[PDB]
Write a protein that binds this ligand. Structure first.
Ligand SMILES: *[C@@H]1O[C@H](CO[C@@H]2O[C@@H](C)[C@@H](O)[C@@H](O)[C@@H]2O)[C@@H](O[C@@H]2O[C@H](CO)[C@@H](O)[C@H](O)[C@H]2NC(C)=O)[C@H](O)[C@H]1NC(C)=O
Ligand SMILES: *[C@@H]1O[C@H](CO[C@@H]2O[C@@H](C)[C@@H](O)[C@@H](O)[C@@H]2O)[C@@H](O[C@@H]2O[C@H](CO)[C@@H](O)[C@H](O)[C@H]2NC(C)=O)[C@H](O)[C@H]1NC(C)=O
Ligand SMILES: N[C@H](Cc1c[nH]c2ccccc12)C(=O)NCCCCCCNc1c2c(nc3cc(Cl)ccc13)CCCC2
Ligand SMILES: *[C@@H]1O[C@H](CO[C@@H]2O[C@@H](C)[C@@H](O)[C@@H](O)[C@@H]2O)[C@@H](O)[C@H](O)[C@H]1NC(C)=O
Ligand SMILES: *[C@@H]1O[C@H](CO)[C@@H](O)[C@H](O)[C@H]1NC(C)=O
Ligand SMILES: *[C@@H]1O[C@H](CO)[C@@H](O)[C@H](O)[C@H]1NC(C)=O
Ligand SMILES: *[C@@H]1O[C@H](CO)[C@@H](O)[C@H](O)[C@H]1NC(C)=O
Ligand code: NA
Length: 526
């Protein structure tokens, strides 16, 4: 019940799951709290302690803007932080099987949230089921988001960029030095994440500093080549100087702007983050990964294209309706509280909201590719198109492109397509299989049958959990026992992928091929 780590001892707690036991260590610090002189800088290593650290409750989340478009609605508040916000937030969690395993595969979760929001303590990232059912070890960590995590004056060590990525990387290193003490195998570590988490995992594949801190990788609705995923160095410093003036910190000694930003209080920084961009989008990443020459040594689109990444197996996939979630956060004529049948002009206006700096011709090109219907008179035509438009451009095509290019260098790749709409969901049915709603299935929440989940959902979850674990332990995401359809490796030619649902598990070919040729070849040029 007490574990001895390189920096000191840590007390955990015991949990009861499915007639068994899991040992949870919630809130182990992995770095010096980034307060004061340290705000905006890379994490600094933690100096040892002599007491017994009590890791029995989730630690503080990093400071972030909550979104308030739906106060009181669980469909949206399930994603908001469920723990005190604070700059002092560099902590991680460990769930290990009981009894203590000997050489367990380790899964390391990295949450998404547009790089502005998110926390490891969310209910739908509870690692206790994966520990219990598959006897792997699960680790999640908090990393700095928003400007306190990704503010960038390039080359300048007071605000270098990618600090949140270096937070992640320092947790990964903590697992390397320490997880053996917990009964884990540091030579068997799978990163997995979703949305910006998945884009984070993809960047860890590119970053030499993490090459040796994990084995394999799983990308859920997210990759670095997605349009939101990397902010330019043009944009980044335009953004940190607009933050400077909004807070009365514009100077000319670039480092003393930073000194000036260090005396502001967190919430002052948070209020102004939203306006350093002129035209914003529900998907807008105001402060993101940057080519800092340290974590990321070159533009990732080039590293991907020329084979400059960790060679290993990747598991990649996306959801059928990645786009809908964002339509109710800005798009006109859209509401979670009606079927949001919009018109041709509302569609048009919804493109100017999601594609704001884009030419009139650009927005006409999108409308032309997405509005030649199998039936001109279905009222929901434009509603479905704009959903598809946002999902294809922001998630599905980048993920497919990443998998093709990665697989072109000889490693096994597996692609999936999650298409199950859960029965419980608090959002209306027109929104479909939404961004982030496979996460609970990966984490085994439908296993605790309880109130929410049909037995069909319990089974799908049980299978996904097995495929994920087999991928982590063995590099091959098969379920070998219950006469399951085999999951083929994705190769650049036939582009086979697997669909996940409660009814038919089917092998299909070339997801969204016609849509994605538009996004990945034609549209980048406008
Ligand atoms: C780079 O930044 C400038 C300045 O941004 C403005 O000032 C900030 C403090 C904040 O209040 C922002 O909302 C402002 O936009 C941008 O120039 C502005 O461009 C917009 C229109 O696109 C408009 O607000 C003003 O006409 C401009 N303001 C000034 C002071 O010139 C500029 O567009 C940004 N982007 C690039 C690529 O340079
Ligand atoms: C779906 O709902 C939106 C707005 O929902 C509600 O309606 C408002 C009157 C107000 O009470 C809001 O706070 C609610 O959330 C409808 O969009 C509105 O349409 C009319 C057109 O004149 C008008 O009230 C506004 O311009 C629109 N509001 C927007 C775009 O935000 C939409 O018409 C509804 N559609 C269907 C099919 O029910
Ligand atoms: N735009 C900025 C930055 C940002 C860019 N892209 C993002 C993606 C997610 C979160 C934030 C961002 C912002 O913070 N809010 C505006 C958009 C509203 C998003 C609310 C966040 N909650 C949800 C999340 C996810 N699934 C959701 C499903 C639905 Cl139905 C509703 C909310 C969701 C999956 C990953 C975790 C977060
Ligand atoms: C650390 O925890 C020690 C033991 O706490 C035990 O577990 C918690 C969850 C409670 O149920 C408590 O009653 C138990 O005794 C404490 O004795 C010790 O003081 C704690 N140390 C610090 C620094 O908080
Ligand atoms: C765990 O497995 C690795 C190889 O995956 C091996 O080198 C190591 O010695 C093992 N440690 C144990 C069994 O404690
Ligand atoms: C002011 O700028 C110079 C470079 O022009 C820099 O070396 C110096 O450190 C800055 N001032 C302080 C107090 O850091
Ligand atoms: C396989 O099927 C049995 C029932 O025959 C079920 O109890 C078990 O959980 C299934 N295993 C997986 C990994 O799906
Ligand atoms: Na728990």
């Amino acid at each position: 019940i007490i574990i001895a780590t390189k920096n000191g001892k840590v007390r955990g707690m015991q949990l009861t799951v499915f007639g068994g036991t899991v040992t949870a260590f919630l809130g182990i610090p992995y770095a010096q709290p980034p307060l004061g002189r340290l705000r905006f800088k890379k994490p600094q290593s933690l100096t040892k302690w002599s007491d017994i650290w009590n890791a029995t409750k989730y630690a503080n989340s990093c400071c972030q803007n909550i979104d308030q478009s739906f106060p009181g609605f669980h469909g949206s508040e399930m994603w908001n932080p469920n723990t005190d916000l604070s700059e002092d937030c560099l902590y991680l969690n460990v769930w290990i099987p009981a009894p203590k395993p000997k050489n367990a595969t380790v899964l390391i979760w990295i949450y998404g949230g547009g790089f502005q929001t998110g926390t490891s303590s969310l209910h739908v990232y509870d690692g206790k089921f994966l520990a219990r059912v598959e006897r792997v070890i699960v680790v999640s960590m908090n990393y700095r988001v928003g400007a306190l995590g990704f503010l960038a004056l390039p080359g300048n060590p007071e605000a270098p960029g990618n600090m949140g990525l270096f937070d992640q990387q320092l947790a990964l290193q903590w697992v390397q030095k320490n997880i053996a003490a917990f009964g884990g195998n540091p030579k068997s570590v799978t990163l997995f994440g979703e949305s910006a988490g998945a884009a984070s995992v993809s960047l860890h594949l590119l970053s030499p500093g993490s090459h040796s801190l994990f084995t394999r990788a799983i990308l859920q609705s997210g990759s670095f080549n997605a349009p939101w995923a990397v902010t330019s160095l043009y944009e980044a410093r335009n953004r940190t100087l607009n933050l400077a003036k909004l807070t009365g910190c514009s100077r000319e000694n670039e480092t003393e702007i930073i000194k000036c930003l260090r005396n502001k209080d967190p919430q002052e920084i948070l209020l102004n983050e939203a306006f350093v961009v002129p035209y914003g989008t529900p998907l807008s990443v105001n402060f993101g990964p940057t080519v800092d020459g340290d974590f990321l040594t070159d533009m990732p689109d080039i590293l991907l294209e020329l084979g400059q990444f960790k060679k290993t197996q990747i598991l990649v996939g996306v959801n059928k309706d990645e786009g809908t979630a964002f339509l109710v956060y800005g798009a006109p004529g859209f509401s979670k509280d009606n079927n949001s049948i919009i018109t041709r002009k509302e569609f048009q206006e919804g493109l100017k909201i999601f594609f704001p700096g884009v030419s009139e011709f650009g927005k006409e090109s999108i409308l032309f590719h997405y509005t030649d219907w199998v039936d001109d008179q279905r009222p929901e035509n434009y509603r479905e198109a704009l959903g598809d438009v946002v999902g294809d451009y922001n998630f599905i095509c980048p993920a497919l492109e990443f998998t093709k290019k990665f697989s072109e260098w000889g490693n096994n790749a597996f692609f999936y397509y999650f298409e199950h709409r859960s029965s419980k969901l608090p959002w209306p049915e027109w929104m479909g299989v939404m961004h982030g709603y496979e996460i609970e299935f990966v984490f085994g929440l439908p296993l605790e049958r309880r109130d929410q989940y049909t037995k069909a959902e319990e089974i799908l979850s049980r299978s996904i959990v097995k495929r994920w674990a087999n991928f982590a332990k063995y590099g091959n995401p098969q379920e070998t026992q219950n006469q399951s359809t085999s999951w083929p490796v994705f190769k650049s030619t036939e582009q086979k992928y697997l669909t996940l649902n409660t009814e038919s598990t089917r092998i299909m070919t070339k997801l969204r091929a016609q849509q994605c040729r538009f996004w990945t070849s034609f549209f980048p040029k406008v």
